[PDB]
Amino acid sequence: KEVCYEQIGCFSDAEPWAGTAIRPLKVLPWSPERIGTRFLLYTNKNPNNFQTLLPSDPSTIGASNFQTDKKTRFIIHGFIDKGEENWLLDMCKNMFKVEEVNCICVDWKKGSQTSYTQAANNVRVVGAQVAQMLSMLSANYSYSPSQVQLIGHSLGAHVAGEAGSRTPGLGRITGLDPVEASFQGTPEEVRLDPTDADFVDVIHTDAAPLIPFLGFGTSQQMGHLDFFPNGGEEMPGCKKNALSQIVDLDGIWEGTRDFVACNHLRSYKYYSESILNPDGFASYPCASYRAFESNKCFPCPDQGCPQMGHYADKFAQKYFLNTGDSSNFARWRYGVSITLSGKRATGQAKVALFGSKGNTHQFNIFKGILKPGSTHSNEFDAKLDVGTIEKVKFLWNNNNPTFPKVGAAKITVQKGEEKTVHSFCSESTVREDVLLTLTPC
Numbered sequence: 001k002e003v004c005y006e007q008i009g010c011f012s013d014a015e016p017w018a019g020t021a022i023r024p025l026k027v028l029p030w031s032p033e034r035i036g037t038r039f040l041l042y043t044n045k046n047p048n049n050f051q052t053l054l055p056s057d058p059s060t061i062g063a064s065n066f067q068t069d070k071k072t073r074f075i076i077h078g079f080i081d082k083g084e085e086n087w088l089l090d091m092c093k094n095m096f097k098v099e100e101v102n103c104i105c106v107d108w109k110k111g112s113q114t115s116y117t118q119a120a121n122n123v124r125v126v127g128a129q130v131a132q133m134l135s136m137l138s139a140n141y142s143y144s145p146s147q148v149q150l151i152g153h154s155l156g157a158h159v160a161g162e163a164g165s166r167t168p169g170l171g172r173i174t175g176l177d178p179v180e181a182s183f184q185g186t187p188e189e190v191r192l193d194p195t196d197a198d199f200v201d202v203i204h205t206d207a208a209p210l211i212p213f214l215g216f217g218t219s220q221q222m223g224h225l226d227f228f229p230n231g232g233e234e235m236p237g238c239k240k241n242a243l244s245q246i247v248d249l250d251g252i253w254e255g256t257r258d259f260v261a262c263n264h265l266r267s268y269k270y271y272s273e274s275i276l277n278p279d280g281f282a283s284y285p286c287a288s289y290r291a292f293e294s295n296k297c298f299p300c301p302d303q304g305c306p307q308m309g310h311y312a313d314k315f316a317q318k319y320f321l322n323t324g325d326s327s328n329f330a331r332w333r334y335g336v337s338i339t340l341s342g343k344r345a346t347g348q349a350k351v352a353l354f355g356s357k358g359n360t361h362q363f364n365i366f367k368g369i370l371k372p373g374s375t376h377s378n379e380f381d382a383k384l385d386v387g388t389i390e391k392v393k394f395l396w397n398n399n400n401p402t403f404p405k406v407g408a409a410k411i412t413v414q415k416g417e418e419k420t421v422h423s424f425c426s427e428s429t430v431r432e433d434v435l436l437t438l439t440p441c
């Protein structure tokens with residue numbers, strides 16, 4: 001069977017769309033009018049109220065604040081959680097704080113709020129409509145798709161994939177936690193993949209297996225650059241879903257079943273913040289999140305670390321990094337080596353960096369027997385880049401009738417984005433819970 005819609009062509013239920021083991025059900029995409037796709041344009045001139053654009057009517061572009069001399073960024077959603085309807089606009093608003101741009105929100109909510117197989121297939125049509133908007137801009141306004149980025153969250157990532165597939169030379173597609181079900185294992189035609197655009201960057205935030213962890217995202221690398229903040233499966237500050245061998249995808253997408261969307265939505269929360277923090281998400285290539293957490297993949301490679309999020313395009317396999325558990329998710333990773341002094345004691349040795357741009361909190365470096373003349377290292381993610389490190393503060397908390405004094409004769413510090421190391425020293429020691437300051441050496 002095949003359905004054909006005006007100007008966007010036809011869609012069949014032939015393989016790989018259906019009739020396969022990965023996509024068993026033969027379901028065709030709803031019509032453009034049932035889906036009700038809307039292209040809402042926001043620009044710095046009109047940051048609060050939209051102007052409606054129609055891909056079949058060039059005049060809407062003339063009757064809008066659209067600028068042919070600016071970049072364009074489409075925001076295409078997927079799963080909408082209660083209270084989350086304004087996220088796309090919230091994201092455009094952050095773009096306006098750093099650039100003059102045409103921000104088009106693509107709302108196709110009616111087409112997404114139905115059974116999963118139907119929502120998955122409706123993606124085909126929405127992506128064809130986005131490609132339609134792009135062919136029209138190209139045709140009637142000589143505006144090249146190289147000047148466009150498609151940001152697709154969840155099912156929207158595959159909507160972007162489709163658009164790219166249909167629009168040769170699209171500059172960029174950012175996938176924010178692309179859904180896995182009905183897309184993994186299919187020909188590149190069905191899913192977002194590197195061939196959909198000149199640069200495809202992907203953020204994974206809910207990649208644990210659907211069964212039984214109810215993870216909506218994918219573990220599979222899908223772009224030129226793939227980022228797995230906090231490992232990509234569980235995000236700090238997010239509650240998780242109760243396990244189950246039986247998941248009701250249809251019920252969750254039609255909005256009748258409970259679902260903890262926190263992990264799935266983090267992808268766009270981090271992207272939105274990255275727009276405002278150009279250095280807050282340095283990412284490190286690593287074999288696994290465990291190797292990263294075991295201090296095996298730091299500092300940044302010679303050429304630098306790519307930023308996860310908005311500025312990932314500045315960069316010329318798997319990338320890891322950590323974020324905060326709440327807003328200003330931005331973090332900067334540092335490495336430190338403490339050579340102990342004073343007397344033997346058992347406890348938790350800590351360090352805080354004080355630089356030109358500010359200082360960090362105290363971070364746990366090593367816990368155990370603190371023996372003079374020994375050296376221990378660790379890496380931690382702080383809340384800011386301290387700039388030039390001017391001094392470091394050592395502190396230890398004990399776990400002794402002689403009131404031992406523990407110190408650090410030397411602390412070396414390594415900023416993730418620098419090639420050199422910085423040395424700080426002291427000949428002093430302090431008692432538990434007393435701050436010792438080390439100076440340059």
Ligand SMILES: *[C@@H]1O[C@H](CO)[C@@H](O)[C@H](O)[C@H]1NC(C)=O
Pocket residue numbers: 058059139140
């Ligand atoms: C847009 O370009 C197409 C293809 O060249 C043309 O058929 C159509 O009439 C143009 N639209 C308008 C409003 O001129």
Ligand SMILES: [Ca+2]
Pocket residue numbers: 161162165188189190191192193195196
């Ligand atoms: Ca594709």
